[PDB]
Design a protein around this nucleic acid. Structure first.
Ligand SMILES: [Mg+2]
Ligand SMILES: [Mg+2]
Ligand SMILES: [Mg+2]
Ligand SMILES: [Mg+2]
Ligand SMILES: [Mg+2]
Ligand SMILES: [Mg+2]
Ligand SMILES: [Mg+2]
Ligand SMILES: [Mg+2]
Ligand SMILES: [Mg+2]
Ligand SMILES: [Mg+2]
Ligand SMILES: [Mg+2]
Ligand SMILES: [Mg+2]
Ligand SMILES: [Mg+2]
Ligand SMILES: [Mg+2]
Ligand SMILES: [Mg+2]
Ligand SMILES: [Mg+2]
Ligand SMILES: [Mg+2]
Ligand SMILES: [Mg+2]
Ligand SMILES: [Mg+2]
Ligand SMILES: [Mg+2]
Ligand SMILES: [Mg+2]
Ligand SMILES: [Mg+2]
Ligand SMILES: [Mg+2]
Ligand SMILES: [Mg+2]
Ligand SMILES: [Mg+2]
Ligand SMILES: [Mg+2]
Ligand SMILES: [Mg+2]
Ligand SMILES: [Mg+2]
Ligand SMILES: [Mg+2]
Ligand SMILES: [Mg+2]
Ligand SMILES: [Mg+2]
Ligand SMILES: [Mg+2]
Ligand SMILES: [Mg+2]
Ligand SMILES: [Mg+2]
Ligand SMILES: [Mg+2]
Ligand SMILES: [Mg+2]
Ligand SMILES: [Mg+2]
Ligand SMILES: [Mg+2]
Ligand SMILES: [Mg+2]
Ligand SMILES: [Mg+2]
Ligand SMILES: [Mg+2]
Ligand SMILES: [Mg+2]
Ligand SMILES: [Mg+2]
Ligand SMILES: [Mg+2]
Ligand SMILES: [Mg+2]
Ligand SMILES: [Mg+2]
Ligand SMILES: [Mg+2]
Ligand SMILES: [Mg+2]
Ligand SMILES: [Mg+2]
Ligand SMILES: [Mg+2]
Ligand SMILES: [Mg+2]
Ligand SMILES: [Mg+2]
Ligand SMILES: [Mg+2]
Ligand SMILES: [Mg+2]
Ligand SMILES: [Mg+2]
Ligand SMILES: [Mg+2]
Ligand SMILES: [Mg+2]
Lengths: 259, 158, 134
RNA sequence: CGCGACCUCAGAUCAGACGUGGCGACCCGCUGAAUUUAAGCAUAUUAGUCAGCGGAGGAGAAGAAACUAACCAGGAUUCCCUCAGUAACGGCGAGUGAACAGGGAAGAGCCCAGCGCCGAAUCCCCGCCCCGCGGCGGGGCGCGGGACAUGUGGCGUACGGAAGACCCGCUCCCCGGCGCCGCUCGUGGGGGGCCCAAGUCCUUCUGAUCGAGGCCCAGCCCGUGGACGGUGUGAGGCCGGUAGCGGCCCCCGGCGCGCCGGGCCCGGGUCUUCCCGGAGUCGGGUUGCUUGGGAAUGCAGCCCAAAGCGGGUGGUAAACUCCAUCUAAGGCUAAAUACCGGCACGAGACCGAUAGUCAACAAGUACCGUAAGGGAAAGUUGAAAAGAACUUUGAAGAGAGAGUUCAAGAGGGCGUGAAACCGUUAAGAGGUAAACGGGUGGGGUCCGCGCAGUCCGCCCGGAGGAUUCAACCCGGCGGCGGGUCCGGCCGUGUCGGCGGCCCGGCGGAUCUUUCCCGCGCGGGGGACCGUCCCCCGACCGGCGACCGGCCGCCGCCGGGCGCAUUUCCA
RNA sequence: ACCCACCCGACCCGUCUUGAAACACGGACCAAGGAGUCUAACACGUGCGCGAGUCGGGGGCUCGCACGAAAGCCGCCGUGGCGCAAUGAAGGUGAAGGCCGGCGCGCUCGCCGGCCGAGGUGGGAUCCCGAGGCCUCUCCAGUCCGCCGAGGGCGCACCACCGGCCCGUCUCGCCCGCCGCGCCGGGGAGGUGGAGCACGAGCGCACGUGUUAGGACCCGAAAGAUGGUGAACUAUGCCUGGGC
RNA sequence: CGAAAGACUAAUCGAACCAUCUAGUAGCUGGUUCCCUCCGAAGUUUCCCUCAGGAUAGCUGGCGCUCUCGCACACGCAGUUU
RNA sequence: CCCCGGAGCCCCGCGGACGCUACGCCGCGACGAGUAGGAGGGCCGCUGCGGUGAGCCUUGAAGCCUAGGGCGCGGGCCCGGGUGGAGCCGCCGCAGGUGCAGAUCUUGGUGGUAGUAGCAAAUAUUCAAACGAGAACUUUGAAGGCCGAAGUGGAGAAGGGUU
RNA sequence: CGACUCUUAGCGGUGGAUCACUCGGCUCGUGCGUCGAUGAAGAACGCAGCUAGCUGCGAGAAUUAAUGUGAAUUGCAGGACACAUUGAUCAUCGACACUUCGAACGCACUUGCGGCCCCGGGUUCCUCCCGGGGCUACGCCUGUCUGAGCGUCGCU
């Protein structure tokens, strides 16, 4: 809000003794705006309490490994059909979930090709659902150039644009990434972890060179490896009804002694 | 009033500081502008290194830095004299020259002569006209590179 | 999307641009499609509508297959008046009801020299793009 | 008593030039508070800050060491990060508070006076010609004026310079024009103009659609275009645009080639002989301000007032002494840097008409004040004005009918139309002001019923009626699970191959310069170690990591089974 | 839940106050507006990443930014910050001890070889060992599985105590060292000051609370300062007119 | 400016008016916006140009941690008494 | 002295809820005043952003109103009907100029007071007519009155600015 | 029942909250970075067929020319134009024009007084008179012309 906002008046308080109320009141004149109420956050005209400043700490800076950890986490759950389906993406009829494709797809220079591809791969019904979501936004962002809203679609990770990013462009829903420049804002939109992507074999090879396997450095991010796991056996149902453990448990007291 | 334990601390917000707050919303826009301007300057100085001129090796001052070595401002006159480059010309071939540098020890001097010698070896002086007189190199070492050198020219590695 | 960083995509800016548009610019805004018949013949989608073209109204109340001659072009009001597109006021007097040019189709153009040269320029650019696409 | 030089001064509506005011976001020079903090206050602080005056530019200022340092030393200025809330200052309280180094952004360096040499070799203005002329210039020609020796120009300035002799190697740089060629990064520089994809297809809602299903061919078309706006609701395809190393036309810039006109005989090293520095300034004393600068950081006034192996600095006063380091008292200089004013654009997790600027509107308007100055309120009929013809009552405003509109339960301050408050209509009550909490009753308003609500669901027994089964085999498909791990793919731990090791790469302060290349160092090999991969065998976790057969079980389809069965229905 | 009736109950809220129904203030009524914010610095708590490190800025390389003024990467990855060491005003100094054997006279002092290597007491969650049961449809043999377990151990963290080491300081003492034998340098014993060491816990990011500096929860002075406008009223002087 | 009343100086005078410094400062008045749940004070200490305020103890809450054993197998602690 | 793909089960160690959003579900005891103040939970509420609901919406969004039906301890919420006429919400995250009865609060509006106070300075009006929808007030005529030439008369100055 | 009063609801008023819109703001960024004696900013007064305000312009006055565009402008009139023609209307803007105050310039601020050169009527240069035109600020520099001085000399 502007600096001068509210203070461009010259207004003194009629002190006590005049009845009225000790506010600074507009000085002199034969207008409506005379002996009014200036400056106070409560007055009409007035001046907002704690006017907003530009030097509010807008930007927010995050540790680099943590950023990478998130981006690994999103990738890891771009596998897992459950996490992709739960994130909404109609991935029912898709052939294999870390969906990787031939690298002619770098070639394509026309939406025609890019859509045909998506229909063969059965990824179109996500795009279809994007069209279905296209609707008007609720409220004031309508009058501030955020008027329409819709779904996020299939990600498409490419290794090099040989034409591709032109091809997939008008197809609403699609975002294109380079592998070498991935982004958590796009791999986990809403801060929500799953997301159906579509890999290019050239790009899908490059992932291990970028992120490093568990027994090999990144070899592309100088000093980095994957984050180690805290617990390895995630399925505790496989643990808890093992021989080794159930051997060593007292028998479950389960009678219900009511009052 | 202070309450039970804490640094008895002095902030410097008693002048009208909000009148002189300097935001950094530029900086991205700035960073680009420099970068464009940088790429333009390269393109203007066509086969010449983007870097600038070549600069001497030089030790830092003080006990602290002492052990490290930087690029200096420009090669001394003795170093040009010994290498055998006329000081007025050295500017015209991309050799930084300061003339305010003393030269105390002969270990720093011979190193910096060696630098200029090496430079003169791996330099490709184009002739003034396309018709080729003396000094100007062969059209072989010219066609094979009218290439710019990315980064600092012959970088110093401590 | 639009990528040109000197265009606007800003409701307030586009509307202000529109409503406070100058006559010669409004001419372009007030354009209207050719009939499929002419679309075939001239190789042109649409044309800036003019004082005495022949025209169908395509949508609204006056939507109909009659071919009325244009009567005038009220560029201030973003509208054109058409021959029998009219309504009786309280006291019997006919009043030319406005139709917006874009909800109308030109069946017959009023061809002058300049209109002829315009159509020649638009058709040529269309065929350049088809040659570039091929 | 003249005439003539010059000197110092006047006057011209003398000829020709410039300066004056504005703006002021940023910038330079002065000037300079007090609220305030210190829980009082006077030093301090607020603050070299507001107000005041001056002067600028697209930036300004600064800037090519009288610098840092004390190192094995750095090397103009500006800017950022850091130094650092540190050294220091301070009623050592409140509080205040730099610099060097280091890493970056940028990067560019120069010229006089003097000292000297050169016939003033220089400059300005006249006037005549040729070119050029919307940033008054080139070339030539004039016994045409003047400036200038009280010093103009070339060489030259501390990084040394000049003049000499011989060592060497050889000779393009600039401008005034006139042309002409390649339109020269947002991927054709800048500006202007004019252009360029695809449905108003079906049906159906609607006052109007832009909405909803649909559109065999793989999916209506186009899609480098599904930004945005407009158009009687919500529009990739109606229109303007949007995309595109898309088009055409203008103009202008910038750089490439040719010709002419001029200028321009412009080096380097080596040895010798010469040459060399800014005074009422430095410095001191002082008083006042200023600084973190403290026995004086910087600026001032006044007084004193210099030197030349001098002078200045070397963060505690002085003397002696060595070292180090610059060279002051003359000047110019792009760049990274700043920008709440201007012109022109772009955007927003902002505001949405008591908000957001004072100001969405005929706002710095109306209005007030002698004046300096103060300073509002105020957006919205409808898709379209189709803004109510006509009849009638009234002097008229106002009505009553009629009409327009999807609607006037939208009628020109008209979208929606809350509350306070008022009018009426209906219902109920009424001498302790009203109103309230708890508890019942009565009446109303609607709401759910029921014209039996006897509510359903299993299973069973009987009684009626109707289709094909189930049970079973047979053929097919699919699924599960299993062990023989049977056969093969798959991968964990271990051992064997030293096998990838050079046909496996990186890393290493491990080594070797027996190596190679480039100049004791750099790069590359070559050993070595660490790490990552092939070959087969063996043991073991046989792991949701899979295949193939076999087994068992399940399910579906079709075959079989026609009826004491298996269904449906009452 | 609308109205009415009746019995019982029942003073008007806000606020300052020991005390408010108060003869204490504010309040006729309704609508909209309206006050603990943001920045910086500190501290503690909590969450995440990495961990004797950590770090990201600032800068740079990748784009015309549609989304991007993002995202990514950097021998800059670390100049540098904080951290990994203190203590002294400073010159400076700077965290090890034990044991064993030998040689100097073991002199609770000086020098040479070997071994262990962050001391010890008490309490300590927890682990570990475990006599012994306690049965099995018989009399004994007898491996397997538990359940308990008297008794005994290693003892985390943490606490209390005693030792030890480093810096400052004092007191007392006796020896070593060498290019410079000196107003040189080095050690020992015993106290005592230190925001110390005694097998590390930090760094960055985020949220919360608190405390400050800022307009700093919102409203409120009397005043103070700078620069400007007024003698059309009125005060006094003067000029020129009028009136009694 | 005053034949003096601190009179008058544009309804303003024991220091005019206008704009700014200025959102001047306030240990003092006033106000300070939704629900449920759980815990729940103090007006006493010492210091203060302190007495209508701070500081510091105290009294409150929150976060915990370390242990204890009703899992036939307990140590320590108290607004008592012996 | 035999096997649960069958002991038939009050216990079943072969496999295991109707139950198991393990931030879930269930059982036993105990307890419950509260200013200032503190903390927790709010499927309480407001506005905007990333996600997400193949959400809703001209076959009627928001708002508004309702002696209609309900839920919740409560903040609040949901449905019916009316009105309205174009947008709007649920969930998971993030963000804040986020919730009013008070401030002699600010801006706007409205009451009671109230058809009340009040329309009393300076002696004065009456008759007829005209116009006119309409006359206490205009105009004309007639009468009765006042200002009483230091004027309620006739002309300027200043000031107004078309009166 | 009566009037009045209170309560609730219906409908109507008053009033303009709410909601929905937004050619306006606020903030951040980019590029450029240009006023003036050749008369600036600012002020004044003018100018439309009917026009008061806002805007736009300057006695050529809601504009002239030019170039681009290519049929309007429109509240009503009137008109033009041949929109197969420099051609309506917009845009651009390079030519032209630009009343009075204002640094503000003949001197004054009445809008008053002038001087000096030339031109037309007036004369027949007769000066008057009238009208038109061009000059007439201060400071300062380079030159130019006229000079001043018991300033310093020389010759006579
Ligand atoms: Mg405001
Ligand atoms: Mg809303
Ligand atoms: Mg550089
Ligand atoms: Mg000026
Ligand atoms: Mg004070
Ligand atoms: Mg105080
Ligand atoms: Mg005081
Ligand atoms: Mg100061
Ligand atoms: Mg100032
Ligand atoms: Mg400058
Ligand atoms: Mg200098
Ligand atoms: Mg420096
Ligand atoms: Mg620090
Ligand atoms: Mg200071
Ligand atoms: Mg000279
Ligand atoms: Mg559209
Ligand atoms: Mg639309
Ligand atoms: Mg189109
Ligand atoms: Mg000072
Ligand atoms: Mg000293
Ligand atoms: Mg300078
Ligand atoms: Mg308004
Ligand atoms: Mg309003
Ligand atoms: Mg407003
Ligand atoms: Mg409104
Ligand atoms: Mg309205
Ligand atoms: Mg409204
Ligand atoms: Mg309606
Ligand atoms: Mg309506
Ligand atoms: Mg209305
Ligand atoms: Mg409306
Ligand atoms: Mg009644
Ligand atoms: Mg009190
Ligand atoms: Mg009392
Ligand atoms: Mg009370
Ligand atoms: Mg009383
Ligand atoms: Mg009081
Ligand atoms: Mg009251
Ligand atoms: Mg409110
Ligand atoms: Mg912490
Ligand atoms: Mg604290
Ligand atoms: Mg605060
Ligand atoms: Mg105040
Ligand atoms: Mg004072
Ligand atoms: Mg005073
Ligand atoms: Mg305040
Ligand atoms: Mg007090
Ligand atoms: Mg508690
Ligand atoms: Mg309680
Ligand atoms: Mg409370
Ligand atoms: Mg509408
Ligand atoms: Mg906000
Ligand atoms: Mg209220
Ligand atoms: Mg009365
Ligand atoms: Mg008269
Ligand atoms: Mg009513
Ligand atoms: Mg209003």
């Amino acid at each position: 809000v502007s600096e001068l906002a509210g203070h461009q008046t010259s207004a003194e308080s009629w002190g006590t003794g005049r009845a009225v109320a000790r506010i600074p009141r507009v000085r002199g004149g034969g207008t409506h705006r005379s002996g009014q109420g200036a400056f106070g956050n409560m007055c009409r005209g007035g001046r907002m309490f704690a006017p907003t400043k530009t030097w509010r700490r807008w930007h927010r800076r995050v540790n680099t490994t943590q950023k990478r950890y998130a981006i690994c986490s999103a990738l890891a759950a771009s596998a897992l059909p459950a996490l992709v389906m739960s994130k909404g993406h109609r991935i029912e009829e898709v052939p294999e979930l870390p969906l990787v494709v031939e690298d002619k797809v770098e070639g394509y220079k026309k939406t025609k090709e890019a859509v045909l591809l998506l229909k063969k791969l059965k990824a179109w019904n996500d795009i279809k659902k994007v069209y279905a979501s296209q609707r008007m936004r609720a409220g004031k962002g309508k009058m501030r150039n955020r008027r329409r809203i819709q779904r996020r679609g299939p990600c498409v990770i490419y290794n090099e644009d040989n034409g591709i990013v032109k091809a997939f462009r008008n197809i609403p829903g699609i975002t294109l990434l380079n592998v070498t420049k991935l982004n958590i804002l796009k791999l986990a939109p809403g801060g929500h972890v799953g997301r159906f992507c579509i890999w290019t074999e050239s790009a899908f090879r490059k992932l291990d060179d970028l992120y490093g396997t568990w027994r090999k450095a990144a070899s592309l991010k100088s000093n980095y490896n994957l984050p180690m796991h805290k617990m390895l056996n995630t399925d505790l149902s496989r643990i808890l009804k093992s021989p080794e453990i159930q051997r060593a448990l007292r028998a479950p007291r389960k009678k219900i002694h009511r009052r | 009033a202070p309450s039970r334990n804490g640094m008895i601390l002095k902030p410097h917000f008693h002048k009208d500081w909000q009148r002189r707050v300097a935001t950094w919303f530029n900086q991205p826009a700035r960073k680009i502008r420099r970068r464009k301007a940088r790429q333009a300057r390269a393109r203007r100085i066509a086969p010449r290194p983007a870097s600038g001129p070549l600069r001497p090796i030089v030790r830092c001052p003080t006990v602290r830095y002492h052990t490290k070595v930087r690029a200096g401002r420009g090669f001394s006159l003795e170093e040009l004299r010994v290498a055998g480059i006329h000081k007025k010309v050295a500017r015209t071939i991309g050799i930084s020259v300061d003339p305010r540098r003393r030269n105390k020890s002969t270990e720093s001097l011979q190193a910096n002569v060696q630098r200029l010698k090496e430079y003169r070896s791996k330099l490709v002086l184009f002739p003034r006209k396309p018709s080729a007189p003396k000094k100007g190199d062969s059209s072989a070492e010219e066609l094979k590179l009218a290439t710019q050198l990315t980064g600092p020219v012959m970088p110093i590695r401590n | 999307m639009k990528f040109n960083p000197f265009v606007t995509s800003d409701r307030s800016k586009n509307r202000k641009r529109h409503f406070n548009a100058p006559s010669h610019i409004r001419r372009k805004i007030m354009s209207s499609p050719l009939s499929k018949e002419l679309r075939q013949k001239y190789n042109v989608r649409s044309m800036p509508i003019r004082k005495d073209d022949e025209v169908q109204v395509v949508r609204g109340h006056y939507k109909g297959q009659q071919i009325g001659k244009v009567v005038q072009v009220y560029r201030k009001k973003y509208v054109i008046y058409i021959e029998r597109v009219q309504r009786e006021k309280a006291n019997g007097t006919t009043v030319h009801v406005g139709i917006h040019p874009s909800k109308v189709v030109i069946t017959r153009l009023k061809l002058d020299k300049d209109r002829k040269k315009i159509l020649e320029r638009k058709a040529k650019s269309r065929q350049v793009g088809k040659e570039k696409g091929k």
